[PDB]
Symmetry: D2
Subunit: 409 residues, 4 copies
């Protein structure tokens, strides 16, 4: 079976998502900063709205895959579980006085239940009584130490971050913050072992949860197949150039793409992922955070045999939207601006995900922006941002397209 994503707006057929879970249940106001998450959310309500999100997509024929289901299914294949535990439970990871115990107990659990733990972390208290466990209990008691052997991963919720389907293949992203590489470990397990992938046909363009990668980091929110052989990769805090460079070579090498357009975010706005300030809604329509998007320096990177490293990159003086426009054959793109005329209040309606050309899913709260999408012709299906929103992520961040068709450019 052919898996691949060939645009940003085209009809979406298979998307992978992750509902908030045990991970989020462990968020306290003090530990949410060092567990890489915005705030504490109402978990049971966040699940209900996510399920509402999952259903408004499914109701339209789209195949929607929840990470916990895939993981549960994957874990039943002994080989798969062993591949994950061998790399997740090590002396270096949990301490030599706990690997043995930790592993036997996780292996003693029902599939589903295990997935929940592989995703939401495992605490000292979750283990059966022991010396291993008790020693940890006192490090928390007497020194203030963390009581997580296996840390939660609430950010699994944003399936967009961890991996990226770029045409006929996927990247296994080396995550910027080391603790988030545990998420890639699991989505890689799924793609490597689960039946829906293990047989399917697709290329692995970059990544390896075994290697270290060093300063090569890459995050999903930065990558985009817009079609027409083009790929937009934002280069700021999380996506380094040493990665972006390899992804390009790898792609050019198999003719996946004819041009990688590197979108350089200025230091100031560099902590923002590209799909946070720039999103597609239709063949030629985008939402944009003006102040930022007008400051992006576009760089075209394309194939070149006259170079040893087989590539050419030229700075671009035309604006980013102009480069984007021209790389799609269009005279120019229409633009809706988010983040002062007749705005009733500040809203940030970037990060909607297209279900097909002209149909989009966004947040209820961005009424003003959502209104501008409809006057410009987009059907805007909304979900509640109340709990999912407190995550610094929208529809786009919460979806990972696996199968999406292209459009004529």
């Amino acid at each position: 079976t052919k898996l691949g994503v060939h645009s940003e707006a085209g009809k979406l057929r298979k998307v992978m998502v992750c509902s908030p879970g045990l991970a989020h249940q462990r968020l306290t106001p003090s530990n949410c900063d060092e567990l890489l998450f915005d705030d504490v959310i109402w978990v049971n309500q966040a699940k209900r709205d996510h399920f509402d999100f999952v259903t408004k997509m499914r109701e339209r024929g789209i195949d929607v895959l929840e990470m916990h289901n895939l993981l549960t299914e994957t874990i039943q294949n002994p080989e798969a579980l062993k591949w994950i535990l061998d790399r997740k439970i090590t002396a270096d990871s949990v301490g030599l006085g706990l690997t043995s115990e930790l592993r036997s107990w996780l292996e003693s659990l029902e599939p589903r239940k295990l997935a929940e733990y592989l995703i939401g972390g495992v605490a000292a208290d979750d283990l059966p009584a022991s010396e291993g466990a008790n020693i940890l209990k006192m490090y928390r008691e007497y020194l203030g130490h963390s009581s997580f052997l296996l840390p939660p991963l609430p950010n699994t919720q944003f399936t967009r971050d961890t991996t990226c389907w770029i045409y006929g293949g996927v990247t296994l992203n080396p995550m910027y913050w080391p603790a988030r590489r545990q998420e890639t470990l699991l989505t890689t397990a799924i793609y490597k072992f689960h039946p829906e992938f293990a047989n399917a046909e697709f290329e692995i363009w970059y990544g390896d949860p075994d290697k270290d990668h060093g300063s090569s980091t890459l995050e999903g929110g930065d990558v985009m197949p817009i079609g027409n052989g083009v790929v937009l990769i934002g280069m700021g805090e999380r996506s380094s150039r040493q990665a972006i460079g390899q992804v390009a070579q790898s792609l050019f090498a198999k003719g996946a793409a004819e041009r990688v357009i590197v979108a350089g975010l200025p230091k100031s706005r560099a902590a923002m992922a590209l799909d946070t300030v720039f999103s597609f809604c239709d063949r030629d329509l985008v939402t944009v955070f003006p102040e930022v998007v007008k400051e992006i320096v576009p760089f075209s990177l394309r194939p070149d045999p006259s170079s040893p490293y087989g590539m050419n990159i030229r700075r671009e003086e035309k604006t980013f939207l102009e480069v984007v426009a021209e790389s799609l054959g269009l005279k120019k793109l229409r633009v809706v601006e988010t983040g002062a005329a007749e705005r009733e209040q500040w809203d940030d309606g970037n990060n909607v995900v297209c279900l097909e050309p002209g149909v989009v899913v966004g947040y209820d709260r961005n009424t003003y922006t959502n209104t501008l999408l409809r006057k410009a012709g987009v059907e805007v299906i909304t979900i509640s941002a109340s709990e999912l929103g407190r995550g610094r992520g929208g529809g786009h961040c919460m979806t990972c397209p696996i199968v999406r068709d292209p459009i004529d450019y």
Copy 2:
């Protein structure tokens, strides 16, 4: 024979590293990115450092400067291939500049090469090219850093990345990934340099080629104090994943009988043991009361009825009484820091031998209590080296130091 057998014993061989190029590249905008408090005065820092160095040599200590060692190591082609093969990859430099950075480095005169390896290399140092130019373009227009090879100003603190523990040394996996680059350099040195290659010594833990994950260790936390005992501070930068493993290895070669895990409280977990607790004599320690009284001590011992061949108990006593009894002592003479003219932190001095310590010129009170309690306190200037947070102890990596009759 290489080996550090106490904290107060007569010191004969130590490794230090003067500030240099890495510190010339400090900006007030990149301090934190590079993990360095503030921008020092380099030329003046090098003089103050040299003075510190000279004062030890005059006591007949064999002081080895990290740059000298590296320069001599990289004259060995094999030594150099080992390093660049790990330091210059697609992943660290980007596939567009691996050949031009490498060759260019290979073309320089040895000493200049070691200055660059430790001090970083920017886009402008390299001859004009496509790569160089785009790296520059990224700096100009996106404000991006433009280091093909980033500076390591913390090399100045040789105590951090490696530890000599009796007849052996740890190759410390650093909390910050950035600083594992320093461990790679010292490793090359202990591997190839003559001073080490032929020498006998065990490598207890660490390996610059592996990913230790959550295992991390910082020199300031380790102290082989004698009597087969090793103190290891446990906080933000030295984990139990790491410490547990160090203990197991030490115990597996009889290199030690017991490790006492100094549990630092969460408020002070950012502090390295050697920065709140430091020996000055056979039974004398400067101290940071507040923190030291809250350390939870843990005794680690070998136990054949343990799946990991170890045993652990929480000491009901204070950290100071536990250390005291570990060395056969009763009390521990203590000078406190943190009446007094002002505030001064006199922790972190380094002993050259019993009763002789090197400390900063600025901590007068603590300095005079140490002379009153019987210690010769050589003083060095803090105005630049001290902005860097580190003291005499953080600036020295003991290689050979004699034992003490405990």
Copy 3:
């Protein structure tokens, strides 16, 4: 008539609240910190959740007064408006290049709008085209400077903060951040000129908007009338002893109170108002954040004739709760500790009457426990109003509440 708050759990008859409004319409992520507010909220949806709040209170028969409405009736009285303006529009606040315009203009608007601008702030664009407002637009465009003639005051939403009703008198609070004393001005105006306050009988224990209070600050979530001449007051980072001492003295001096129990909040915690880690739900039932409440040092401050300054202080050895328990004539208070599913902070509910309290819907656990404890919990949504860091208790200013014994 006669106004006054006489307990924390007694039947509530009159409360003042403030709805999110133009203030919050002005929140941007790059200013909601320098304007003090956890985050940008969905304004219109917060208005609805607040109205739902007012509604659940009104239907139980409580007289709910609204700051904008109250302010609006107030400034219709030219005297009242001239008093507020003379103090809010000066060269030290608006600047000498705008005082006559910004004033002339506000004065030409209808009461309901003028009032929205006083709570909502006023930007340079709002002012009628003038050389003055334009150089400010100029400073905004070129310098990235605030272009606000008058501030936004988003925290008016939390009415519990700026004034405290204690046994038949009120405290007009000296606020910590000077950029919040603007709130206290407006409420003083209301209590001064509005018909429901002008004529009613009540005292002014402490406070005055015309004075600079130096280090004496006071915050309402720290003040609680619990009953027989007792007043609890938190001593964090927002309520200073220089202020707590003068309120205590004035209270004693006037017969108003017999003992003030100073709640000593520990160093780390001293950033939380008392009602945030401690709240009443019934005659002998409170919610508490254990970590904090077990560490608070209680201090009894009583009147003393033989004292030069009329008072005496004794550090109590009983825990805060035993002390408060004994102060109320009780053997022990029941306690639902909050702060089984997930984390949640059920504190900060406001009693409507003994046993009935209004809280947030998200705190399932804590409310489930509170109901097992005999309390009927009416809940509202914390989705947007909750991004404010405060709950039902922070959002209400009791004006009339019956005793209990």
Copy 4:
């Protein structure tokens, strides 16, 4: 000569400075953050670096006034002691059960002692044993409260900030922050009561301790009477537009200045005060921090009888440097740029006279440039004094400096 500063570069005749002292002795790593200090400094070495600097001006003829010295003399006039105490010691500042104690005691001290404490702040421990100081020592003991009745005023050392002489008069500046409001009081008492000030003719252009001022703040570093009736006032985070326009209105009214050029800085909350980025070294010289100065937006403020508020603001079209030069009747200003061996920041030097500045020894690069441009650079140490974010200029309050065009 009557009092009045008439330029930035002309001959310096009288200045006020303030050396480190008891306030800096009170700094501890746990509080130097509030009191605005990059780290604790070595107080006695700081005092020697301050004096040395005082001595380098004193030997060149400048009459240098020292704040502890002036306050001290000032204190000896009872009325002046009452004025201060009556405002520094209220129930609002110290509290009900301490007002009598602190005052009765303070008034027991000898002049040089009282001044010490006024600036260095009074603690609970300094008071005679009493219940009032004990209830205050209990809060510290059990809640962790501060021990300061009166808070230390270490920023006094930067006398540029709290008051400015602009031509024939001065401003009493309503400071931005909290741990700085109390300073202006002291210097206002010196200017009102002290002999050299009480009897001299001069105007108070703006300011008053006794009033609130709201969001009207002005900080000296931003004010520069550069002569030719032009006054320069930087507009950022501590100098508000409400104070600036009032200052120009009183100046324009008594015809002391003809134009006030507002240098409006771009945003950031890092403070960043005009003299820390733009400094005069000579009648046509100036040091500049490129990154920031090119971003400044010039605004001219001149008087206008017709207009309502007797002045009119017209934004400028050429850069900050061309408008300044143009306001001085100059073709262009020569500039030395700061921040090629290491990073440097040599702004903030202080002219003693045309072509003679005083800066820091650490900024060798910018200083060589400055000497090459015809200026004599006298140097002082930054080791401790520049740990406080200020140089010669932030450390001086000119009182008498002649007009340029000489």
